Amino acid sequence: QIHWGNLSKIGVVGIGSASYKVMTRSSHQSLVIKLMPNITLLNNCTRVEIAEYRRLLRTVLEPIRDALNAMTQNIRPVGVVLAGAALGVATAAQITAGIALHQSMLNSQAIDNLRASLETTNQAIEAIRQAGQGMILAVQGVQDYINNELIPSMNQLSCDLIGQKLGLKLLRYYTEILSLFGPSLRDPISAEISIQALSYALGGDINKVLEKLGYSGGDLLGILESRGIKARITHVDTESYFIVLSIAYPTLSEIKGVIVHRLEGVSYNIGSQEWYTTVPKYVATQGYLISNFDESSCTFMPEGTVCSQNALYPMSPLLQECLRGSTKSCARTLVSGSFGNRFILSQGNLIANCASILCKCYTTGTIINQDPDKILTYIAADHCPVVEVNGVTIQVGSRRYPDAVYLHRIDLGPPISLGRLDVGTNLGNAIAKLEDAKELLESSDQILRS
Amino acid sequence: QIHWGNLSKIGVVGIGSASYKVMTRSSHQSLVIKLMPNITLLNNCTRVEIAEYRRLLRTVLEPIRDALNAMTQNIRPVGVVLAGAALGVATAAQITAGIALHQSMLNSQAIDNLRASLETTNQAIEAIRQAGQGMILAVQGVQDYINNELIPSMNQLSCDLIGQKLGLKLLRYYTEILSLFGPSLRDPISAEISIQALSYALGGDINKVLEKLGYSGGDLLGILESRGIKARITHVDTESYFIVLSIAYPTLSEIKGVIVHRLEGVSYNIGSQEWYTTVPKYVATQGYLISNFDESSCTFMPEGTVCSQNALYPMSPLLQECLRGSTKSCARTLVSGSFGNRFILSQGNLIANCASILCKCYTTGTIINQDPDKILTYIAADHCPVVEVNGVTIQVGSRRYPDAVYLHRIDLGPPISLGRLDVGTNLGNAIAKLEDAKELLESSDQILRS
Amino acid sequence: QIHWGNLSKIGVVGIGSASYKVMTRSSHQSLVIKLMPNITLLNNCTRVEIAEYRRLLRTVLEPIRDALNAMTQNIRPVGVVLAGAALGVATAAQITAGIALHQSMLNSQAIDNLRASLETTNQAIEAIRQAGQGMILAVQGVQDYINNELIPSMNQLSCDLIGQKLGLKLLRYYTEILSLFGPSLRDPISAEISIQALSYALGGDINKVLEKLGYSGGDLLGILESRGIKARITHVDTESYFIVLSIAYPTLSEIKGVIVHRLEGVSYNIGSQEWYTTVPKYVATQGYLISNFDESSCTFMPEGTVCSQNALYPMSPLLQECLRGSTKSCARTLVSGSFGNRFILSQGNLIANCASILCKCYTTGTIINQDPDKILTYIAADHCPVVEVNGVTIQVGSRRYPDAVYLHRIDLGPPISLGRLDVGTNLGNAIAKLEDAKELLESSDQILRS
Numbered sequence A, B, C: 001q002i003h004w005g006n007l008s009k010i011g012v013v014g015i016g017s018a019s020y021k022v023m024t025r026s027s028h029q030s031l032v033i034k035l036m037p038n039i040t041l042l043n044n045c046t047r048v049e050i051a052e053y054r055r056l057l058r059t060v061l062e063p064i065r066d067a068l069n070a071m072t073q074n075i076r077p078v079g080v081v082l083a084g085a086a087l088g089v090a091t092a093a094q095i096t097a098g099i100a101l102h103q104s105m106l107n108s109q110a111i112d113n114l115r116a117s118l119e120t121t122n123q124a125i126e127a128i129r130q131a132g133q134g135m136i137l138a139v140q141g142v143q144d145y146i147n148n149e150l151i152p153s154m155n156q157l158s159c160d161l162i163g164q165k166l167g168l169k170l171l172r173y174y175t176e177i178l179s180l181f182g183p184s185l186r187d188p189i190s191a192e193i194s195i196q197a198l199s200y201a202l203g204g205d206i207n208k209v210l211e212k213l214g215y216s217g218g219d220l221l222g223i224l225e226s227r228g229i230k231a232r233i234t235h236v237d238t239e240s241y242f243i244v245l246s247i248a249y250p251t252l253s254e255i256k257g258v259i260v261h262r263l264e265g266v267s268y269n270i271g272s273q274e275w276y277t278t279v280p281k282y283v284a285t286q287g288y289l290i291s292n293f294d295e296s297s298c299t300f301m302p303e304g305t306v307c308s309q310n311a312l313y314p315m316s317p318l319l320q321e322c323l324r325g326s327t328k329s330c331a332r333t334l335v336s337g338s339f340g341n342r343f344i345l346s347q348g349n350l351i352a353n354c355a356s357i358l359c360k361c362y363t364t365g366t367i368i369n370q371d372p373d374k375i376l377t378y379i380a381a382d383h384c385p386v387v388e389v390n391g392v393t394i395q396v397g398s399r400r401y402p403d404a405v406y407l408h409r410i411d412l413g414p415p416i417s418l419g420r421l422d423v424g425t426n427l428g429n430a431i432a433k434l435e436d437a438k439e440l441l442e443s444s445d446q447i448l449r450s
Ligand SMILES: *[C@@H]1O[C@H](CO)[C@@H](O[C@@H]2O[C@H](CO)[C@@H](O)[C@H](O)[C@H]2NC(C)=O)[C@H](O)[C@H]1NC(C)=O
Pocket: A038, A039, A040, A119, A120, A121, A122
């Protein structure tokens, strides 16, 4: 429904389209952060530092444990039902996340079993296999430093030095835990934490964790780049100091009929002024419908755009009509003295603002002049097979854009300034004029009677 | 003064209120960054690396020392007066900071005493306690690495290797000093630096520093999360290479009469279109007055909102009237196809857009239908004690909201698009119409005297 | 062309001007990232880890190598021409970057020479002196760790432990390579990467690299602070696992006739309301023209503001006329209860809002009262040589601003609210009024002729 012919007359072309894929999650795995390292081979040389580390962790873990218990106390078997009167107030996201928290909850007996299995481990990353259960992955954030650096030096360094070295690592690890799970974490029940954000808490790298979870394949890099691998908090243990997370590797589903277009613009000249049409960087089409496209959570892979959130949001009716071929609906803005988008290659042709750059025909050696009654030049092989546009020599193919029409056959839109202060200054001026004409505007019917 | 009854008719409710606390500082402590480590036990193996490290530090420290001297030269005893004619131009913030710099500074004789005490220490963190003065905390950024890693290896590694290892740490530490205090630091006189931003310069962790400064208590986590612990520069020494900072632990004072409200919204349906009322996330009230609330510097603790800056700023009169019960003043926007806020639990009742989600009464198994001449459904126990709204079973309490009124009894506001380009396109179109009607608008009085 | 006299009547002054300098590149140097470390002295204790590291690197390097080959295949000797019909679609930036890529491409014979020289080195940073060509700088990201930590410990640590320690470093280095050159880097051809963003890939610090490249001088800190040292990808080798970059140290050219002004405001009082003129933080003048100034890529050095991008962009005509002396064109906004900009020192005089702060003359003890028919007070020595404004004692010089005129001789502009939602609410209200008056508005000819 995008009218490319009319858009090209104001210097707007598309430079690439792609399919739209979103993420859905079906399976969830468990990942436990083991906050207490195994220090058996350090022979009580870190007793003071460990005790301080535990005290600091309690101030972070206790508020989260209370928050989790506050929601799960209001969920009972019906399926399950929520005691809305007891809960009082909650958003849809909180309610949905609370149900999943109650469902994807390790049973109390499994918690006792998990506690014992954690105590016997001394590795940084270990899979815990319970009979007739899903594998639980346990990660200890300072175990590698203990096993690789501190234990081999036990016969070389003093007992006090060993404690000091571990103490530095423990306090830095607590800082990261405070950053992730401290007061900055609004609503732990509904929080979704990306695997990258957990990197330091997992030992400073996620590659081994991803391998142990079995997350691999051709879509991994795109999914990972869009931050599509998310973890949710399901249990906080303040007695044994561990945190249970539920993590899911999503599957990609193409959305039928959605095309994501990348727009690109070239400036044009009206006399001695250089103007530029204001259009979005990306737009989405589905049949007749035109919508904006938010690329903030998307990765543009060769096989399509992978987005970890909903990227489609509505576009105003006036902007839609601009994209449907109404040039007078499109706004335009002035450009700085040194503007880089003064020509573009599109469908084998050159669309250039030859009033602001030097257009020369390399084949004949002649300079290409842009008529003052026109705003753009459409260069194809029928007029110049090889062209020098800005000192760059380019060969162009057969004509795909008609020869430029006069300015009087193009209806141009209003000039605007997009800056925050410019908008405020011009809007206040407009509101003042409307407020000064209120008496005229209110009596519209009486004036229209005459 | 917020009219909750009329707001709920367009799907706006409050999901929580809290008190408002601000920070004030009374006492200040001195914290000196000792840039030159103690390398006595390294036996001259780092001579070249230390010399290069000193040269790089001078390029950073000298501009700051000149800036500090340029301000203090204009402050003289009256109990001090600023020579405004000599200074020429200065903002209020610069003037106030300059007075504090002149007041809160170690005297010249105390600088010599501080210089001698710094040279004799060899620890990463050490309290310097003078006769009849406040304690001064000295921090050395690479001393832990020297004491824990380099010195124990002196009899194992070559002299060349020792220098190379420390040289790497010195350059990395200089990079952080350049980031903190280099050309990016506009106006060192009035700059306030959070303790978190100093973390690397203090050795990579702030927990021990806070303990030594005596900063503890139940408010620490909230204050630290809001970045309420700030340091200012009071002295730069380019001969012994240290920086003196003044740091204050704030006290929290609740502002009486201020309530911070968290607003949440549910979409509503007009025929087949799904609309959403646009309102701020947080608003503040003080009696009859309604203000915007900036949450950027705030932390939402269970006992109230802790902010390190002033969070209240004015709200436009039209938006205030919307919050006072004028529904026609409130703007509305279209939502994407997959919208998450289609129901909410409030006061034990469910406010749901039953035209966009399937509402069913679990008690009787009957579907709940939303009439076309209504926009929302208000579910309470008198109609359905247990209800399923989006696959979630919820029990609701007694009625706290009236049954939905017809759409013709609700005055709805204007549809808008909040995006930056949509605003520019629509504002430009509006301005063009006003400019084309200038003659009619400027001749209003003639049209009215008839 | 800025009218300072009329601006001071609404509390706007300049607090400093500076010259404007931009960056141009003439010479370029080659920097090669050597992804494979030298591990000869580790006696194949890291065989498994190295094999995994190479496998991960291939998934990142191969897409980039294909992208580079896609552009360079379309560039042939004319002194080169682009096959636009084969390329089809490309922006000016992509075309210009592609030409430089073809020109700055190391020839195939030089690539074989470079491959052999990389294999023989074992240092973290090393210059490769190719005969009859420019010096090529080779950087290895983990070589320092191998040479300083692992090799001296070979006789002490187990062979398995050596592999584990290096494996941790390799996976972390790969993560940074994925961040820099992975799917997040769209269009590698035109990408420009700052030297700071390459810091981890170069071993965690750039100071030695800058010294080896010869980049030094008095402008280094300013150029580095504004991110003016940028690298482009010119070759990717998937057989020997290295990346060639082109890096340039820019030269600064002052732009003639451009002055960058910093603006600062003071609040004023109308009755009991405190207002503030809304103006940009920085503005630029060139003769008669007035432009906005983007400070995002600029560093304000004592010798002038150094910018790595074009900082000038157009300013709306209404805002320009405000700065040219039309006070009614300038918008104004309400301020919060605690506003810091209630006085300013300018040209040795104090401009103060004495209705909102306590102004008293220290010389005579009398309080300075601001008349309700005035909005500001201009304090000079002819009325009070030494004045206390907000508890701060300031001496002021001779009069440089006339005595405040009455409010009825000042034309004030429209009140506005700059917030995103406040703009949307008020714009929607204004659009609705225009839409309700559409029939009247498109009747101007009939209404006047009556
Ligand atoms: C810490 O690690 C040690 C091993 O270094 C653990 O001891 C192991 O415990 C398991 C229990 O299943 C036994 O199968 C192993 O034989 C034990 N190994 C050794 C060397 O004794 C120990 O349980 C861990 N936890 C604590 C608290 O010490």
